[PDB]
Amino acid sequence: DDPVVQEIDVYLAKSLAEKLYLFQYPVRPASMTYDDIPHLSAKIKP
Amino acid sequence: DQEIVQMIGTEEHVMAAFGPSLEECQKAQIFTQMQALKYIGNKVRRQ
Amino acid sequence: IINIKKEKRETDEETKQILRMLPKDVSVAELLRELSLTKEEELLFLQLPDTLPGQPPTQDIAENACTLADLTEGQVGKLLIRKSGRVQLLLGKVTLDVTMGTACSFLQELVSVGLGDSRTGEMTVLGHVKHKLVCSPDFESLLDHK
Amino acid sequence: MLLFCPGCGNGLIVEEGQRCHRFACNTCPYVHNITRKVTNRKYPKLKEVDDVLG
Ligand SMILES: [Zn+2]
């Protein structure tokens, strides 16, 4: 078993290291998204 | 309730067996954490 | 009746209860069908081990944990796909193995919340997350090496 | 079957509105009118023919 193909490279980015968040909806399937739902605002804390 | 059912299970028989619990819960007016905690407190014994 | 707001069935993979009228994949085939069969980019989410096989470069130390926050930009490792479906990650002298994580079916939206100003920021939806990967150290190799 | 509201996720009950039967939640104004036929079969296990003993 040798690496015949798919010798993909891996790079690292630090531009959005402190600005990247992962939001997931456990109750909303992946089929329906909130792209069409108009948003108003979001309250957050550092 | 969707999250609760997903945690319990996604099998047809699982949902069929858990249906009665959801029905008994919906019969009452308990839908929020505050109401559920108030009910639990009312049902709590004195220490 | 609106078609994009129908009732959803419990099974997130078979929410199509009413119509107008999935075998478990592997990482090698996923990458193959993402690169050759199509060319559209895809957002992936991979879980790396706690400590990477490196040292924090001039980070004031100790054998502490070395995460991506200490490494710099540029080429850090390679992704190899051997025969029989083996998918490895050469991140230096050691080689981890990448496997398919829990198949999430619920909505996962990747967003960057940049607080450019102390009073107002910007939330930018970069894309959607569909697949999950897990990278694990090849403990068998690490043990049989020495 | 068991249906849930896409908005909040609570259980949906079948009620009668002003035009047609509909699924509705007890915690939000969300509703869904019934357009075509909807069925939920269970296929209960039938009683097999108990053969003679002996
Ligand atoms: Zn609802």
DSSP A6-46: EEEEEEE--TTTTTEEEEEEEEEESSS-SSSS---------
Question: CA nearest C1: which of D22, D7, D13, A36?
Answer: D22
Do C106 and A30 count as a contact with CB atoms less than 8 A apart? yes
What are C12-17's contacts with CB under 8 Å, separation 24+? C12/A29, C12/A30, C12/C105, C12/C106, C13/C105, C15/A29, C15/A31, C17/D1, C17/D3, C17/D38
DSSP for C46-111 reads EE--SS-SS--TTS--------TTTS-SEEEEEEEE-GGG-EEEE-SSSEEEEEE-----EEEEEE
Q: Return phi, psi of residue C145, to 5°.
A: -70, -45
- Name the residue among A8, A19, A24 with its Cβ closest to that of C106: A24
Return d(Cα C102, Cα C124) in angstroms, integer.
26
| Rounded Cα distance, C27 and A14, in Å | 26
Query: Which residues of chain C does A42 touch, with a Cβ-Cβ cutoff of 8 Å?
Result: 123
Query: Which chains have 3+ CB pairs within 8 A of B?
Result: A, C, D
Structure tokens, C138: 């090849």
Structural resolution in Å: 3.0
- Where on the phi/psi map is residue C98: left (φ > 0), alpha (ψ -120 to 50), or beta? beta
3-state secondary structure of C9: coil
D44 Cβ under 8 Å from any chain A Cβ: no
Buried b (16+ CB within 10 A) or exposed e, C42-70: eeebeebeeebeeebeeeeeeeeebeeee
Angstrom distances, CA of residue D19 to CA of B1, B32, D5, D22: 28, 31, 20, 9
Please name the residue that has the structure tokens 């090698």.
C28
Q: Strand pairing partners for D33?
A: D22
β-bridge partners, A1 = none
Question: Cα separation of A21 and A19, whole Å?
Answer: 7
Does D38 contact chain C (CB < 8 Å)? yes
Say which experimental method was used. Answer: cryo-EM
Beta pairing, strands C45-47 & C132-137: parallel
Residue with tokens 């043990």: C143
Report the distance separating Cα D36 and Cα C20, nearest Å: 10
CB D20 within 8 A of CB B20: no
Chain C positions touching B6 (Cβ under 8 A) are 10
Tell whether D8 is in a known binding site: yes
Place of tokens 């540029």: C74
Per-residue three-class SS string for B4-43: HHHHHCCCHHHHHHHHHHHHHHHHCCCCCHHHHHHHHHHH
For residue A10, which phi and psi values (nearest 5 degrees)?
-125, 125
Contacts of C20 (CB under 8 A, 6+ apart): C3
List the strands of the sheet with D13-16, edge to edge.
D13-16, D21-24, D31-33
Q: How far apart are CA C16 and CA C114, in angstroms?
A: 37
Residue with tokens 């104004």: D29
Is D25 annotated in a binding site? The answer is yes
Instruction: Give me the torsion for CA of C119, C124, C125, C126, rounded to 10°.
Output: -140
Cα distance between residue D28 and residue D17, in whole Å: 15
Determine the residue of chain B that is closest to D41 in CA distance. Answer: B12
Spatial separation of the C-alpha atoms in residues D52 and D54, rounded to whole Å: 7
Whole-angstrom CA distances from C89 to B31, C81, D52 are 48, 9, 66
Running DSSP on this structure, what letter comes out for residue C33?
I
Between positions 5 and 44 of B, the ones with CB within 8 A of A are: 6
Question: Rg for chain A (alpha carbons), in Å?
Answer: 18
Residues in chain C: 146
Q: Is the dihedral of CA A36, A39, A42, B2 positive or negative?
A: negative
Angle at C101 between CA A22 and CA C69, to 5 degrees: 45
- Inter-chain contact D42–B16, Cβ cutoff 8 Å? yes
Q: B5–D4: do the CB atoms touch at under 8 Å?
A: yes
Ligand 1 mean position, distance from CA D13 (Å):
10
- Which residues on chain D are in Cβ contact (under 8 Å) with B2? 4, 9-10
Amino acid in the structure at residue A39: H
Neighbors of chain C by Cβ distance (3+ pairs < 8 Å): A, B, D
